Amino acid sequence: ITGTSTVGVGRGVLGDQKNINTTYSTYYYLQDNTRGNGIFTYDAKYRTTLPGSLWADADNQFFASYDAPAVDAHYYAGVTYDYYKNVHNRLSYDGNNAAIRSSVHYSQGYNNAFWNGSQMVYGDGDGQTFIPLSGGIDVVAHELTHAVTDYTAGLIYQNESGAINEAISDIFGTLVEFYANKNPDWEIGEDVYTPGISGDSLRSMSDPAKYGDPDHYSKRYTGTQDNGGVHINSGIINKAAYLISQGGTHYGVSVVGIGRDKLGKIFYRALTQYLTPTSNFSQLRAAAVQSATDLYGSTSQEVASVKQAFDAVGVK
Ligand SMILES: CC[C@@H](C)CNC(=O)[C@H](CC(C)C)NP(=O)(O)CNC(=O)OCc1ccccc1
Ligand SMILES: [Ca+2]
Ligand SMILES: [Ca+2]
Ligand SMILES: [Ca+2]
Ligand SMILES: [Ca+2]
Ligand SMILES: [Zn+2]
Numbered sequence: 001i002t003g004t005s006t007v008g009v010g011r012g013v014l015g016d017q018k019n020i021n022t023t024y025s026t027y028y029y030l031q032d033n034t035r036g037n038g039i040f041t042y043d044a045k046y047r048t049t050l051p052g053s054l055w056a057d058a059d060n061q062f063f064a065s066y067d068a069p070a071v072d073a074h075y076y077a078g079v080t081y082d083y084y085k086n087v088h089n090r091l092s093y094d095g096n097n098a099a100i101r102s103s104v105h106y107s108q109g110y111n112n113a114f115w116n117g118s119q120m121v122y123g124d125g126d127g128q129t130f131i132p133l134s135g136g137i138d139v140v141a142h143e144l145t146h147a148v149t150d151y152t153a154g155l156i157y158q159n160e161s162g163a164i165n166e167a168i169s170d171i172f173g174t175l176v177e178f179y180a181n182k183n184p185d186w187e188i189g190e191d192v193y194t195p196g197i198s199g200d201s202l203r204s205m206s207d208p209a210k211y212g213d214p215d216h217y218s219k220r221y222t223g224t225q226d227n228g229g230v231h232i233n234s235g236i237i238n239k240a241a242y243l244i245s246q247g248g249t250h251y252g253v254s255v256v257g258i259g260r261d262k263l264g265k266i267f268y269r270a271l272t273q274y275l276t277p278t279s280n281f282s283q284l285r286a287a288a289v290q291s292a293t294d295l296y297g298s299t300s301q302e303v304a305s306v307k308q309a310f311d312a313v314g315v316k
Contacts, residue, residue, distance in 0.1 A: 001025050001054065005033045010062025012072040013135030014191060020074055022060055030055035030074045035081045036097030041074040044103040044121070051103045051119055069104040069132035073122055076140035077102055083141070083172075083179045084148070087261075088268050093147035100144065104134055113139055115146035129194060136192040141176035142169040153275035160280040162230035167237035168271055170205060175264045186242055205242045208235025215239045216251060217281065217314035236313050237284065241267065243309040253312035256305050266291045266306065285310040 003025030011017055021032035021039075030041035031054065044052035055070050062071050077100050084090040091097045101119040110123025113133040120143045122134040133139050146169055149155055155165035170188050178184040183191075189202035201211070208215045213235030220236060221229035243250060244266070247257025266288055274287035288306045296302040310316070 001029055001031060003029070003031075006060060008057070008060040008062055010067055010071040012075065013068045013132050018071065018075050020062065020071060021078065022057075024060070027056040027058060028060040029057075030070055032074065032078055035078055035085075035100075036092045037099045039074060039077045039081065039100045040102070041070050041077070042101065042103040043070065044106040046105055046108050046124075048107050050106075050116065050121065051101055052105075066105075069122060069124060069134045072132075073102040073104050073120070073134035073140065076134065076137045077120070077144065079137060079180050080141045080144045080176050083176045087175075087179070087264065090148070090268075093144060094151045102134070104132065113143055115143050115150070117150070120144060120147075125192065127195070130189075131192050131195050133189075133192050136189050137180055137182070138170075138173035138177045139189055139192060140173075142173035142188070145169040145172040148172070149271065152272045153279065154277040155275060155279060156277045157227055157230060159228040159230075160233065161278055162227050163233035164237060164275070164279060164281070164284050166230045166234035167241065168267065170203065170234060170238050171241050171263070171267055174205060175260060178260055186246075203231070203235065203238070205235075205238040206246070208239055213238075215313065236281065236315065240309045240313045240315065243312055244305055247305075250312040251314075253308060255308040255312055256301060258302050258305050262296075262302055265295055266302070269294065281315045285315050 003023040006022045006024045008020045008022040021034050022028045023031035032039040041055050042051040043055050104122045106121050106123050109126035111125050111129045113122045124132045149165055149168055155161045157165055186206040187201035187204050193202050194200055204210045213232050214220055217236055221232045243255040245257055245260045245263040247255050269291035270287040292303045292306045
């Protein structure tokens with residue numbers, strides 16, 4: 001909407017206060033004009049029609065329980081925009097400052113979040129498996145990263161290409177969590193998963209097997225559930241990425257860590273210059289090796305570490 005840029009204040013899903021960029025025209029709307037062509041947050045009102053209504057508030061104060069998922073979807077979309085722009089020189093998900101749209105309060109008891117081809121969508125959870133999913137910065141960045149993938153490599157959402165698609169979203173979800181630097185870790189979704197159980201998460205990148213996901217290609221799933229295991233076989237690539245950054249010895253193979261920033265540079269270049277819709281795990285290895293070669297040179301430690309990490313997870 002047309003209006004003047006304002007700054008509201010509210011509380012997120014975990015109870016933390018933050019400022020939000022809003023727009024005033026009769027009401028205060030969740031419309032941040034400070035980033036690209038805007039970040040827009042909508043109320044789906046417990047239904048499944050999308051996007052719903054652009055979020056309107058009478059006083060620019062967002063402390064009601066019903067407001068909290070909107071506050072966090074809006075704020076964390078801003079953090080994710082800032083990461084891509086400041087770290088990778090990428091302007092929104094399409095590289096041309098496309099408007100970023102999110103809807104919260106999707107459906108009833110909805111234990112998931114997704115990119116629907118056009119926008120982000122967040123359930124509230126059922127209060128047992130999840131609380132409102134926009135409370136997790138890694139979750140928000142995971143979802144916006146699906147849009148980046150769809151505009152770039154275009155990885156088809158099934159089998160190995162789909163597990164790469166998922167891992168790319170977990171990798172950048174985690175790198176955004178580290179960028180914001182509030183309780184960062186290599187786990188996925190810990191801030192919004194299972195409020196009655198401490199210390200768990202939906203997935204682990206550092207140890208995928210903790211949640212039943214493979215950490216080696218010989219343990220890949222090849223059945224048909226979950227689009228051929230896209231949220232399962234992602235553990236193999238997540239483990240490789242964790243090893244590239246942090247190092248370790250895995251099934252006897254030692255990897256020298258090169259740190260998060262270089263991980264992100266290597267995988268961003270692979271995603272945007274080398275991967276294609278049909279890339280498999282072996283082709284990802286080749287894309288990551290070439291990306292590291294471009295950035296650091298063929299004789300670099302960075303290239304050697306990429307090779308070690310893929311060796312450690314059984315991907316040649
Ligand atoms: C219990 C939740 C677990 C088991 C799986 N979900 C996830 O890992 C993350 C959320 C996590 C980070 C909290 N959501 P996603 O991968 O973006 C869901 N993908 C999606 O719906 O694909 C299908 C689709 C395709 C095309 C249009 C529309 C829809
Ligand atoms: Ca208000
Ligand atoms: Ca965390
Ligand atoms: Ca996390
Ligand atoms: Ca938990
Ligand atoms: Zn995903």
